[PDB]
Amino acid sequence: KLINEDNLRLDGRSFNELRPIKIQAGVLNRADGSAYIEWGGNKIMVGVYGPKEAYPKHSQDIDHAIVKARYNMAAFSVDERKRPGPDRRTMEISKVISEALSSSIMIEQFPRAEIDVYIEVLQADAGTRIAGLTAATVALADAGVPMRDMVVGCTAGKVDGHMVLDLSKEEDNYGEADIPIAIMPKTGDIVLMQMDGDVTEDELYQAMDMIFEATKRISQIQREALLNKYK
Amino acid sequence: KLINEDNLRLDGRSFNELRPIKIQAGVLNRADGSAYIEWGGNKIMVGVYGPKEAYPKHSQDIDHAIVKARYNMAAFSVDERKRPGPDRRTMEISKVISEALSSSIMIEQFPRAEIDVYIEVLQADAGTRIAGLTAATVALADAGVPMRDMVVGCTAGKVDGHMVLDLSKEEDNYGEADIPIAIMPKTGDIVLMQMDGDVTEDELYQAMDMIFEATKRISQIQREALLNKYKIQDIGE
Amino acid sequence: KLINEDNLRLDGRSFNELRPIKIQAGVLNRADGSAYIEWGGNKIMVGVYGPKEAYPKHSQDIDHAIVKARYNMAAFSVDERKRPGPDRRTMEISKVISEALSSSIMIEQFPRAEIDVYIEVLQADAGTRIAGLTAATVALADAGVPMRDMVVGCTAGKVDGHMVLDLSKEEDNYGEADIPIAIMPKTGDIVLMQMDGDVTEDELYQAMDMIFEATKRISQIQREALLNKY
Amino acid sequence: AMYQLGDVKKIVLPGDPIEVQGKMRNGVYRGQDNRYYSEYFGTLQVNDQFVDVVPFSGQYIPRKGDKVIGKVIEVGPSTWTVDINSPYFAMLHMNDTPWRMSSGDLKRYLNAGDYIYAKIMSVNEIKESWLTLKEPGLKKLEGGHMVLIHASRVPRVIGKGGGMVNMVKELTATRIIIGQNGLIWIDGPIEGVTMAIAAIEMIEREAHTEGLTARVESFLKELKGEK
Amino acid sequence: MYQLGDVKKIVLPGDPIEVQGKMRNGVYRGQDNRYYSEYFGTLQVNDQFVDVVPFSGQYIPRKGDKVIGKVIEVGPSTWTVDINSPYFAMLHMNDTPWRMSSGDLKRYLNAGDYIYAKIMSVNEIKESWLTLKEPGLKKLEGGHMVLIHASRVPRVIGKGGGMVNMVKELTATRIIIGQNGLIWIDGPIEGVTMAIAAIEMIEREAHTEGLTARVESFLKELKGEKD
Amino acid sequence: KGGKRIDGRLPDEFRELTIIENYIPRANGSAYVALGNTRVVAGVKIEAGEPFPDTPDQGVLTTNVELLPIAFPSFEAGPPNDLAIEVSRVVDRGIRESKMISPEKLVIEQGKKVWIVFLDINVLDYDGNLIDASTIAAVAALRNAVVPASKEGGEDFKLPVSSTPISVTMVKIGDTLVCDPSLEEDQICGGRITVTTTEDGHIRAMQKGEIGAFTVEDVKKAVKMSLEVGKKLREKYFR
Amino acid sequence: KGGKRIDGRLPDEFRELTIIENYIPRANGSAYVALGNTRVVAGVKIEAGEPFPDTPDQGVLTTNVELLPIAFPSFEAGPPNDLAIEVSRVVDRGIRESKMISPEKLVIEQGKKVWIVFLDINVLDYDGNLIDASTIAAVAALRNAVVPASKEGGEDFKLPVSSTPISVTMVKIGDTLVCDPSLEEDQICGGRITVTTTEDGHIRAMQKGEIGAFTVEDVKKAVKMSLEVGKKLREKYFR
Amino acid sequence: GGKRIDGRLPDEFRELTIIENYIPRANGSAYVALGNTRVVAGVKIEAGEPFPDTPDQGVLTTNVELLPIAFPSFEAGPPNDLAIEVSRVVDRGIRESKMISPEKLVIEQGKKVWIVFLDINVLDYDGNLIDASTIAAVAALRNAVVPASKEGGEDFKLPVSSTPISVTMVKIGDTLVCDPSLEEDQICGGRITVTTTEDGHIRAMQKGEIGAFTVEDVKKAVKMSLEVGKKLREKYFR
């Protein structure tokens, strides 16, 4: 019933060890920018369209652009076949991702514009929403969308009294906490943050530093995924 | 369990024999153009409204008009009671009939316009999708909609190794194939064609030739239904 | 099986007795006009927004305003938890109330306008639809929406051969008839009237007279409601 | 070949071949074989030189000069869009009105939903109509009841020289405006409108009888005598 | 820490730019008063200015470009034209060769008509104003519309327009190329296939010398191979 | 006016009616009805299903009226569902409250299987007064009773019909109350009233619709007129 | 200016609260909450149902928050469900992860029947800070626990309440973090953070909302404040 | 001109890449890229209640999602008609070819059968969705893997009894071509899809879009669809 035996997690990682992460950018042909990510069992496609003016003028917004990110899960993407289409869960994710991306994208550079980010998760492991946000910045730099930073993030949480990094599906369902956080690496500003479970003030501050130091290991992947386009 | 004994179908027809067909045009009062059809067990009402200048968002497509044919089944029309409203099947039929009709309607004559064809099947036997299109051209002619031809069609298929015409509901469910086809008679051009089941290249061409022969008889039922409405007397058809 | 033994109803009332009714005005902050109403077990909140211009202009109607009353039931308002959102019943109720309200609101004074009436039932006894409408007129006057009268109404029906007033949920489900009616008190004109069940002409007129007598007292409870608030 | 008549050369269906000499006009299209074929179900009316196909339909084609009643559907910054019961909506420019307005003030004079009795200034190739209100008698219609009839029966309802339409007015005690588009504006007393309607429906339905005037006058007197 | 003699070090969004010169498009000032890259791109320095060109698309319009655009909305005095840019461009009625009154914009250009126009001005928000008054600017009627990357437009036209003109005669077609990547093609039913086929070969393979010589050989083979 | 409406009809006169039983022979019961130029066809579909938990010893009747976009030009512009729903509820109300069906006799295995009565009405042509047209169609269709009891073993019997409810719609043209309004008369006056009656002289259902008011006397006249014209309608077609 | 917010409130002060337990008595448990001019009413309906197949020895708790159109002029323009759904999930996350309910004791028949606890919150009046008001109302309504065991035989007992989760939502005005933002302050600044805490000093749920970013110091101060105003609140209204 | 707009001849398909077991958490899955049209098919098999009429048969349900990531113009249109047609066309090919053998998917006759969910997500649209979905659909059903260990039993391979190959064809000018790219898909109105099995039989046909075909064109489309269906079967579905 319990998650670790030798200070070893069910999948054999130490406490602060990431799952395998791959990111290829520019995989899509039609999309202005695109990024494919593999994070554990997660396989997520992201494509980015825009910035363009809205037609008809009704949905327009005169201050800045609008980031409309849509997170959708394939019917074969979860354990039991799920009905296609958004639900309460995907709608909460699409908002929280849209809000974070609005903070790094230089939204004042396209007034009255709309920026579509389509995140299609084709197979889902845990922490799924962050692999899509991690890929959203990759697709956005592919599309020439101006950003002041490349948002990046990772999960942490409490499992059998220990604070661990990048929880697996088993660790999420039966562990004590899950903390997804996404930051602007230049500043350390948090643009996404949720938390589930049971944690002390001390463990939460521990969890944060763990994520913060995993962001450096992740950002490198993102930066290497756009760098392989030229070469 | 078999459909034929003496080369006679369960309902008594030869292979290339139509079921009884009726068409009356201009039977609806509100519709700009209308047509009723009875094709075997099928009872289908057609209404045509338009063309007009529309209204809704990105519906003001400037090249031509828009044929919005909507195929709808009454809840009492099929074997088991069906929920009111369109479904996945009725939306597939609505497209294929709209595509077909957009080829005979002279669609360029009304840019920015919209043309509604509501096809309401009140009772369905097999091959309903053709019976409605066949009545739709009558309802379009009744409404003064310009057309370059009167689209007409018929169903065919394989039953116990033989190719037969105008399949019945029993022949549709238990046959080997079903092939609904609609054409423009002048030219022989195909605007609507589907096919389900299992058939050889040779049998399929034989079934095409049977449908082309039937369109001669079906076209004539369409024509007379228009002639009838505002009297006939003296000759000229 | 039956509702009465000593000519007494299940809750102890006589035949023509109203259940207790309270109405408090100006209870919402955001709404232009508001009214809380308690009618027996019924707890109904009404809020009024408007009159203002319609956007988009598509739905605009250009002779007069449009009264959009929306009747919604809270999920915890009925016996078993019901899934939030409108259904066939609540749409019919929204229309029949929108229509009745249109007869008293001076609709012509605001062409192209919209007037929103949100009726949120938090807890439902029988006769809900009159209870909101009776509270609705209060909200409308609380919002300054011009009216030519204060709509008021009441239910009646037949239970074991006796014609009774303001039926309860039990008497509604198992009684023989239910007749909800709403009138304009100046003229006595009926702006809302429905009828379910089985009744003779004679009983139907008896039920009407009983309802007309009760509306005098309910209309005063409406008057008081507006009075205190200022 | 097939049967033809002496001046109206037989009834035709969409796609019937037209083997007649002359300048092909509305109702006829040229097929891929360079032959001509019928576009409509109708009669192959063939006038001098020109060769049409008139159809058996409705959908009133508005042409220059017709006086029509129309409902304003949209108020633009400089034009009103008016539905004249025709496949395309008609336009009324602000300069084609007797009102002095600045641009954007169009809602003070005509709102959407308002009915107008105007004249068709022009019809372009697409049947798009431009309207005017400057001539005497053209005006906004306020109050009353609107009736729709088929435009093909409007000419009998008006009658030669406006006799029929006037004659009704006095028997029916009402003001009546008839559009060439089939819209008729009626406003009288609450009663007068009822007789006026009853008469028009009899006229439209029975628009073949020569003694139409007689019946319609008597039918209105019979409804008049019965009160 | 890094960087070459003149093209420095290819940057990512947010990489710090510690270089002297006038910051221009692609660089923003952080809260720490340092400059950082806005784009994933190349840091481009000349004696006066510091930029980061990105590896992107979304063609920006600059004054003077001749472009193809699809009209999306017909205003009272202006047309809204999509020029394949983040913002729609505006064509006022007074920048046209047509004498029109306000609201008659639909007689000359409707939505969806494609026009070959010239960029009159680009404001700070990249909104474009168009004109059609100069010779050669016109409505495009009929034909097939092709989109290629705007960065590939100069090679497809070629030095002095030789390549584009050369195809036209080889393809027996009229071809108009807009700086936004939209290419208008209308010829015979066949020549359109070759003109398209040539453009994709030119777009994909733009960087080789003798690009002129392939297109000529490729087009000559296509004419021969059915004959 | 002087005893006539806009048509020849007197204030208490209906339009010409044609009722056609067994119009949809593949349904359990059906009927096409034309009321003047208003045309609807109702269809009755009977199936075995599970009863409601509260009433385990009763069959089920569910009613639906489709205002098909084919029936009117302005239909699907809107389409406001409000009118289509009201009619389905009002029509249902007459049939249900008249106890026409006897839904206790439709019990197959008490609390496990009952008979589901689908009563579906498609409007093909709208020329006013949908309620009365739908009710006539509904009643007539229920009279091709034909419950398929051979499918649950048993024996195909005629669905029990215990009364004949007739709905009557009334409006006030000027100062006179008329019934069965045409579409034109339906627009000359705001305010209509439906009163459904049975052959026993009982009122089973009432419904005031549309914007406008009726005085108590008007309501009194409409009850008498609906009873009277309901008796006339019952004798002509529902012998 | 004087250490005070746009109203007299200090950075750590909530608005006036009024909690009215058993506001909807015909429900098993209920609570009306007014937080300034933000008004919501939460209702709990407990019913016997089938547990989820994976956890057969545990009852179910489902939460749903209704942003009624009465509550704001702009409501039904939009209405974006995005805000209404988000509040449902945050309120449910705080209640679920605090283990307030103790759902193993809600088992009637292991693996067949458990107690399903519907928590529905209707927002009647909107003046900012829906998240905290909704959580308070939900907590209070869950304390009128009254689970109806008498319908399943047994004995009516109090639904077990094992903790007191108090959520506090915080926004950044200028350089200072304040809590319980009014509607003015909710729009004055992009960015909010909600921290739900139990009386044991544990953090049970967090949620950053709206467009905008927070430094790590801000987040540390928000967790510290939420525990500190969360403790003050717990003693004042949930003694 | 004797060749197409690309190097393709009239009977040449674009480059195909098929990837079996692309979604290992699905019972069977396959990614297919046909040129720049990219879809991934995923099969989820579960025990459920059969349809009342056929209580001794399994169920096959098909659904094709045109995800908005797949094309810029999506939500301009996007016509839902198109997504639904492809689901029905694709399902028709699998059903009428008797690929699935739905009688062997019976767990408890008249109570429990195997429901085979075939869900195809379109990620990139560059024309010819129908053939690309069929290829993904055929392959994904060949990672058959029905989870019979959850119903006791034994995990077996879902029976696949035939290999239907669907071919979509358009007429550019006077020449019929197959596998139309998006560019060719718009250069001529009117496409025709003919699905064939390895027995030389035609199992499904469908005329689509606005436009007409002569009787000879349909005769050429059948010859070409059978012939290129044979090439495709031998190259990827041996």
Author numbering:
A (entry chain C): 10 to 240
B (entry chain A): 10 to 246
C (entry chain D): 10 to 239
D (entry chain I): 0 to 226
E (entry chain G): 1 to 227
F (entry chain F), G (entry chain E): 22 to 260
H (entry chain B): 23 to 260
Give the original sentences from the paper that presented this experimental model.
The exosome is a multiprotein complex that participates in the processing and degradation of RNA molecules. Archaeal exosomes, unlike those of eukaryotes, contain only two RNase-PH-like subunits, Rrp41 and Rrp42. These subunits form a hexameric ring where Rrp41 and Rrp42 exist as heterodimers.
The full complex structure of TaciRrp4:41:42 was solved at 3.5 Å and refined to obtain an Rwork of 0.23 and an Rfree of 0.27. The overall exosome structure of Taci consists of nine subunits, three TaciRrp41 and TaciRrp42 heterodimers forming a hexameric ring structure and capped on one side by three subunits of TaciRrp4. Based on the PISA interface calculation program, it was observed that 32 residues of TaciRrp41 were interacting with 29 residues of TaciRrp4. Among the 29 residues, the majority (17 amino acids) were part of the NTD, while 11 were associated with the S1 domain, and only 1 was related to the KH domain. The pore created by the three S1 domains had a width of approximately 11 Å, allowing enough room for the single-stranded RNA to pass through, but not enough for the double-stranded RNA. However, this ability was significantly increased when taken together with the TaciRrp4-capping protein.
